[PDB]
Amino acid sequence: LEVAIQNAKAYLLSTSSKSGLNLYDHLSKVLTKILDERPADAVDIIENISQDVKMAEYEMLPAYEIAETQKALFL
Amino acid sequence: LEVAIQNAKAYLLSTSSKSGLNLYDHLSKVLTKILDERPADAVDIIENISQDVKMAHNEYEMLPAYEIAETQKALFLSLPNVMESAYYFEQAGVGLGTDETYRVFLALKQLTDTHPIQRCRFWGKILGLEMNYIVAEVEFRDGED
Amino acid sequence: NLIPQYAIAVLRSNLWPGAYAFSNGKKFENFYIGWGHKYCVENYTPPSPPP
Amino acid sequence: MDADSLLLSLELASGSGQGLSPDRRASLLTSLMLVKRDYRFARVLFWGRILGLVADYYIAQGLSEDQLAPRKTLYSLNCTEWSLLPPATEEMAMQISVVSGRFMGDPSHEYEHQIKEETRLVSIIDQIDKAVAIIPRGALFKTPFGVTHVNRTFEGLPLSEVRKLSSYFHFREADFLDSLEYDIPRGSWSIQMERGNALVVLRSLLWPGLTFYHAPRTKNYGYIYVGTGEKNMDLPFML
Amino acid sequence: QDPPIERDLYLSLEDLFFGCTKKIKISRRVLNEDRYSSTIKDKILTIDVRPGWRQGTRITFEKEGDQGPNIIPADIIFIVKEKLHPRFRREHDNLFFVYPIPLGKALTCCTVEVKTLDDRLLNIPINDIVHPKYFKIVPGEGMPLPENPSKKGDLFIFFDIQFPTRLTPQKKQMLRQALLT
Amino acid sequence: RDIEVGFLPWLMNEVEKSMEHSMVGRTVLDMLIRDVVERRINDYEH
Amino acid sequence: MDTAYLKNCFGTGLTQALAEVARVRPSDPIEYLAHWLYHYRSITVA
Amino acid sequence: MPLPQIYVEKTLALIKPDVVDKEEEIQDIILGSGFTIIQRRKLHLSPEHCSNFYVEQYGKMFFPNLTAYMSSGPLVAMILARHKAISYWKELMGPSNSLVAKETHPDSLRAIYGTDELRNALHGSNDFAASEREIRFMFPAVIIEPIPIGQAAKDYINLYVAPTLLQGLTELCKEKPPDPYLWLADWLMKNNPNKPKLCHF
């Protein structure tokens, strides 16, 4: 099947212009992060490792204000 | 290099405890279907096609955490107010927390019920290497055990 | 209840949910922690207008 | 709520103020572990309390693999003595509609409107679960095997997503679950921030006593119904 | 021809609940071409017992039983039969438990301790007055159905009430004031 | 009637090709493991 | 022949079926095939 | 084997009910030695299972004690895999007879945990083909062997699958039933030659 695996290397991936990512690079990063000791249930985790590799404080400012006024309680 | 690569599979072949599959066989199947259909659309479908691949007399073991639970239900079935005193201790960061304090309180209740004790005080807790101690200061009424 | 000789008398009003009264037998205190409403078995009738 | 809500007072941390004493909390920890032993549930969450006029029904709910299964209810009056409550149906939902009033501690109590208090307990717990059992957005992931599991990689909601009712789900049969933004009345849910806004507290107004816990920084969540056990039909007047 | 031997083999409740396996050594009356020998070619027949097989379920092994010179062997190892247990009586996919409740516990709140075939323990509330025809259904917790091992029938808990064997005259007044008013 | 010559020969060829495609998938996966991990030990020590 | 009827009816299903059965090598291939066909509906029709 | 592909060797490894209590130390030595565990599972073999598991040697090992020591409580089976898996696991084990291993191999796990000839602490694959046979027995639906890509798959199908599938499809062609898959699958379940006919009545 040497011609077939040659075609397999030939595909992965003529770069998809819709996203600019490669199956070889994407799955390579996915597996690289997996080989840092994900657990035996890693089969159920690749669905959002794929999301993370595909992806690759002001919202909580009201938290600081309530903290700021509460300093006077014990100061 | 060889030991690293077969260690990499023998990791990846590790069967999941919930689905019963392993990541290596799943990746083989998903690459098989990807190479079969050739999406163009190859990267975007990797999630959906993974869902598509997942689409297509039992013994039981249990931990040592229920023999303690077997032991400690008897707690819930002439002392001092141990919770009150610990609350005074807890006002300066001293005590075992309310849960452990109440557990020791019920243990002291069992001790008082078992033996003829005039006063049964929570003396202290001496920390240990394998198992800690829960010491009870006891003063007997009749002198008998 | 497991150690009744150090119990505290709990009171649940059932007219103002969240309203509580407490006493160790010597001292006492009161505390409300509800929504501020009176309990009613019947559904809330808006009062009729004047005749 | 899970056992993590019984190692610390997560219930009273919501500011609703109703919860379990440390007596009941430790007793419940041991008893729910023994319930998970005796009944082979995947998890055993403390459902909450039905505050009666004589005694309070401490309620626990069994969770299967398979978490949207018809969850198995348990009750206990003295906390530790857990007993398998029967499951609910539609007839028993229609049966208790003629009865109103506060629960009695003895579940053998009879109403002449006969009707057993156990049937009331079963039906009211079912109604509370179908109405106001909360799941945060993304905490549960529909597995491809036709089964719902914990989304064990779930990160708590962003603080932008905290304030929306769309980020919270009805924990029942139906992202698969129905969101709270269609739970009529439109104002039927109260969202508030406690404890430095590391704590989201979401209380039902239609079923008072429910308070849903969530820590946005992590995946610590849960709901407990500690209350009288009636439906606030006065809610549109009160809003 | 000669009939198949309708052998009966007894399976306890856990075997038909978990789906065990069984081996039955068979006869040595297998014939060669000489048509007078008595040897054996397959010592053991194995049956994969699946969950929920009811009593009378026929498992047949064609061409495996005893054989004469000019007949086809056949055998019906085995008719599913149920052993006595401590205790559930096998009916159509339902388990019938008998709890020897004492009187005084029958008339008031009671909790029935049921070990199941899963090795799970059940505390079933009994808040009804237990007269000697009462039974509580614990649904969806019987044996698995043969047509669907995921689904299971209902458990029935009947009661054998133990009346008192002797009563004090004080206890007679106790009872007369309680029950007849 | 005579499906023994008709259709099963085709299906045996299709099982052979599908298992060949499966082996291609397993091979491609194995090359992916090599590429990722050899990139890991070589670059990690540098 | 009857090839065309069963050309249309089964197609890819039997191919995947015996491919999986030959790969797995179970003790009872026939029961495995029946269960797999059941599961194959349960994914495709639903 | 001298393909582009690279190869994992796999071996079965068991712990008996008189040694399962020390499962954790045995797993610690297994992992520390360099093995990688693929799957765990808790077993309880009835005597029928014991007769089938040793079926390559049950016709010579007429030891009722050997069946009891699998049936007298649960087992802990594992798949282990590392560089020269079976020989390394044999080296840790030592002689199969623990009575010899106790005095001659102090380092052996069988000496540490075992008792005697039949109360051997561990059982595992003594041969690669035996490894495939026992692993395919105990943990179904786990791929362990090279895939039969070529004529071997055709021989497997023609010897096990085709003699039933041909005849069933032939009757399916005579009937031409609607939604033909029910007819085929229910036919295969009902008239399996390797199983008896079940009459659920």
Write out the DSSP string of E101-155: PBTTTSSS-EEEEEE-TTS-EEEEEE-S---TT-EEEETT-SPBPSS-SS-B--E
E49 near E13, Cβ under 8 Å?
A: no
The residue type at D157? L
Q: Give the total residue count for chain D.
A: 239
Burial class (CB in 10 A: 0-12, 13-18, 19+), A74: exposed
Testing the interface with B: which of H3, H6, H8, H76 to mutate, by most B Cβ within 10 A?
A: H8
Beta bridge partners of D199: D194
Give the H window 172-191 contacts with G, CB below 8 Å.
172-173, 176, 180-181, 184-186, 188-189
Nearest to D40 among E120, E124, E125 (CB): E120
- β-strand E95-99 against E155-159: which pairing, if any? parallel
Beta bridge partners of E97: E157
- Measuring CA to CA, how many Å separate H81 from each of D79, H88, H114? 49, 10, 23
Q: Please state whether the peptide bond connecting residue E78 to the residue before it is cis, i.e. omega within 30 degrees of 0.
A: yes
The tokens describing D186, both together, are 């439109």
C-alpha count within 13 angstroms, C-beta hemisphere, residue D186 = 0
Chain B closest-CA separation from residue D64 CA (Å) = 13
CA-closest candidate to residue E91, choices E16, E6, E9? E16
Burial class (CB in 10 A: 0-12, 13-18, 19+), B100: middle
For residue H141, the chain G residue with the least C-alpha distance is G24
B82 near B97, Cβ under 8 Å?
A: no
Rounded CA separation B13/B25 (Å): 7
Rounded CA separation A20/A27 (Å): 14
> What three-state secondary structure class fits F7?
coil
Burial class (CB in 10 A: 0-12, 13-18, 19+), D228: buried
Write out the H or E segment, with its range, that includes residue B4.
helix B2-12
Give the H window 51-70 contacts with E, CB below 8 Å.
51-52
Number of other CB atoms surrounding residue B92 within 10 Å: 7
CA-closest candidate to residue C35, choices C51, C16, C7? C16
H76 near H7, Cβ under 8 Å?
A: no
The tokens describing B10, both together, are 């023998």
Question: DSSP string covering B33-83, please?
Answer: HHHHH--SSTTTHHHHHHHHHHH--------THHHHHHHHGGGG-----HH
Query: Are G19 and F3 an interchain contact pair (Cβ–Cβ within 8 Å)?
Result: no
Q: Tokens 């009902």 map to which residue?
A: H190
- Measuring CA to CA, how many Å separate H139 from each of A11, A70, D63, H22, H79? 36, 61, 28, 22, 9
The tokens describing C37, both together, are 């409403």
D208 near D143, Cβ under 8 Å?
A: no
Using an 8 Å CB-CB cutoff, list chain H residues near F23.
Answer: 147, 149
CA-closest candidate to residue E136, choices D105, D116, D77? D116
Structure-solving method = cryo-EM
Rounded CA separation B141/D39 (Å): 44
The residue type at D174? A
CA-closest candidate to residue D208, choices D234, D186, D183? D234
Rounded CA separation E13/D185 (Å): 52
Write out the H or E segment, with its range, that includes residue A69.
helix A61-69
What is the crossing angle of helices B23-37 and A23-34, to 10°?
Answer: 170
Instruction: Give backbone dihedrals phi and psi of H152, rounded to 5 degrees, phi first.
Output: -65, -40
D49 near D227, Cβ under 8 Å?
A: yes
Query: Are H149 and F8 an interchain contact pair (Cβ–Cβ within 8 Å)?
Result: no
Question: Across the beta sheet with D189-194, what order do the strands follow?
Answer: D83-84, D72-76, D57-63, D43-50, D221-227, D210-214, D199-204, D189-194
CA-closest candidate to residue B3, choices H34, G28, D58? H34
D12 near D19, Cβ under 8 Å?
A: yes
E130 near E107, Cβ under 8 Å?
A: yes
Rounded CA separation F37/B68 (Å): 45
Q: H102-109: list long-range contacts, CB under 8 Å, 24+ apart.
A: H109/H26, H109/H29
- Measuring CA to CA, how many Å separate D192 from each of D16, D187, D201, D214, E42? 11, 13, 5, 11, 75
Q: What is the largest CA-CA distance in chain E?
A: 89
What does R_g of chain E's alpha carbons equal in angstroms? 25
Rounded CA separation E65/E71 (Å): 11
- Measuring CA to CA, how many Å separate E88 from each of E53, E124, G37? 16, 16, 37
Rounded CA separation H48/D24 (Å): 49
Question: DSSP string covering chain D, please?
Answer: --THHHHTTHHHHTSS-----HHHHHHHHHHHHHHHHHS--SEEEEEEEE--SS--EEEEEEE-SSTTS-PEEEEESSSS--EEPPPP-HHHHHHGGG--SPPPSSTT-EE---EEHHHHHHHHHHHHHHHH-EEETTSEEEETTTEEEE-TTPPPPPHHHHS-GGGEEESS----SPBGGGSSSTT-EEEEEEGGGTEEEEEESSSTTEEEEE-TTSS-EEEEEEE-----TTHHHH-
| Chain Cα centroid distance, residue A37 | 15
> What three-state secondary structure class fits H41?
strand
- Measuring CA to CA, how many Å separate E30 from each of A75, E4, E64, E72, E78? 99, 14, 9, 11, 20
DSSP structure class, residue G38: H
Using left for φ > 0, alpha for ψ between -120 and 50, and beta otherwise, residue H34 falls in left
What is the crossing angle of helices G12-24 and F8-45, to 10°?
Answer: 60
CA-closest candidate to residue C38, choices C11, C10, C18, C12? C18
The residue type at E164? P
Q: Tokens 């938290």 map to which residue?
A: A63
Query: Are D228 and C39 an interchain contact pair (Cβ–Cβ within 8 Å)?
Result: yes
E105 near E36, Cβ under 8 Å?
A: no
Beta bridge partners of E143: none
Dihedral angle sign, alpha carbons of residues H65, H67, H71, H77: positive
Interface of F with H (CB under 8 A): 1, 3-4, 7-8, 12, 15-16, 19-20, 22-23, 26-27, 30-31, 34
Q: Give the total residue count for chain G.
A: 46
For residue D78, the chain C residue with the least C-alpha distance is C1
Helices and strands of chain F, counted as H and E runs: 2, 0
Rounded CA separation B29/E37 (Å): 55
Query: Are H6 and F3 an interchain contact pair (Cβ–Cβ within 8 Å)?
Result: no
CA-closest candidate to residue H153, choices F4, F23, B37, F28? F23
Q: D158-166: list long-range contacts, CB under 8 Å, 24+ apart.
A: D158/A59, D158/D216, D159/A59, D159/A60, D159/D197, D159/D216, D160/A59, D161/D137, D162/D191, D162/D193, D162/D200, D162/D214, D162/D216, D163/D191, D165/D189, D165/D191, D166/D137
Rounded CA separation H160/H181 (Å): 20
Contacts of D86 (CB under 8 A, 6+ apart): D118, D122, E138, E139
Contacts of E26 (CB under 8 A, 6+ apart): E40, E42, E43, E44, E45, E64, E65, E75, E77
- Annotation says H123 is catalytic: yes
Write out the H or E segment, with its range, that includes residue G29.
helix G29-44
Instruction: Give backbone dihedrals phi and psi of B36, rounded to 5 degrees, phi first.
Output: -70, -50
Rounded CA separation C12/C39 (Å): 12
Rounded CA separation E137/E119 (Å): 19
The tokens describing D235, both together, are 């809610």
Burial class (CB in 10 A: 0-12, 13-18, 19+), E129: exposed
Write out the H or E segment, with its range, that includes residue H163.
helix H162-175
Beta bridge partners of E21: E48
C16 near C32, Cβ under 8 Å?
A: yes
C-alpha count within 13 angstroms, C-beta hemisphere, residue H174 = 7
Nearest to B28 among F22, F36, F38 (CB): F22
Nearest to F40 among A1, A5, A32 (CB): A32
D1 near D214, Cβ under 8 Å?
A: no
Rounded CA separation H112/H101 (Å): 9
Rounded CA separation F6/E104 (Å): 78
Beta bridge partners of H42: H76
Query: Are H149 and F19 an interchain contact pair (Cβ–Cβ within 8 Å)?
Result: yes
The tokens describing H104, both together, are 């001659």
CA-closest candidate to residue D76, choices D95, D52, D42, D96? D52
Rounded CA separation B50/E161 (Å): 59
> What three-state secondary structure class fits E67?
coil
Q: Please state whether the peptide bond connecting residue D185 to the residue before it is cis, i.e. omega within 30 degrees of 0.
A: yes
| Chain Cα centroid distance, residue E57 | 13
Q: Would you call B5 an interface residue with chain F, using a CB distance cutoff of 8 Å?
A: yes
Rounded CA separation E55/E11 (Å): 10
Rounded CA separation E38/E28 (Å): 6
Using left for φ > 0, alpha for ψ between -120 and 50, and beta otherwise, residue C18 falls in left
Contacts of E28 (CB under 8 A, 6+ apart): E38, E39, E40
Using an 8 Å CB-CB cutoff, list chain D residues near B102.
Answer: 22-23, 26
Burial class (CB in 10 A: 0-12, 13-18, 19+), E118: middle
Using an 8 Å CB-CB cutoff, list chain B residues near H8.
Answer: 6, 9-10, 13
Question: DSSP string covering H47-111, please?
Answer: HHHHHHHTTTTTTT---HHHHHHHHSS-EEEEEEE-TTHHHHHHHHH--SSHHHHHHH-TT-HHH
What is the crossing angle of helices B23-37 and A46-55, to 10°?
Answer: 60
Q: Tokens 């990512």 map to which residue?
A: A21
CA-closest candidate to residue F39, choices A35, E10, A63, E91? A35
The residue type at E23? K
Give the H window 141-160 contacts with F, CB below 8 Å.
147-150, 153-154, 157
| Chain Cα centroid distance, residue D63 | 12
Rounded CA separation E59/H146 (Å): 37
Rounded CA separation C19/C14 (Å): 8
Write out the H or E segment, with its range, that includes residue H130.
helix H128-138
Rounded CA separation B107/B120 (Å): 11
D215 near D198, Cβ under 8 Å?
A: yes
Query: Are G37 and H189 an interchain contact pair (Cβ–Cβ within 8 Å)?
Result: no
- β-strand D43-50 against D221-227: which pairing, if any? parallel
The tokens describing D103, both together, are 């629960």
- Measuring CA to CA, how many Å separate H4 from each of A6, D103, F27? 12, 73, 8
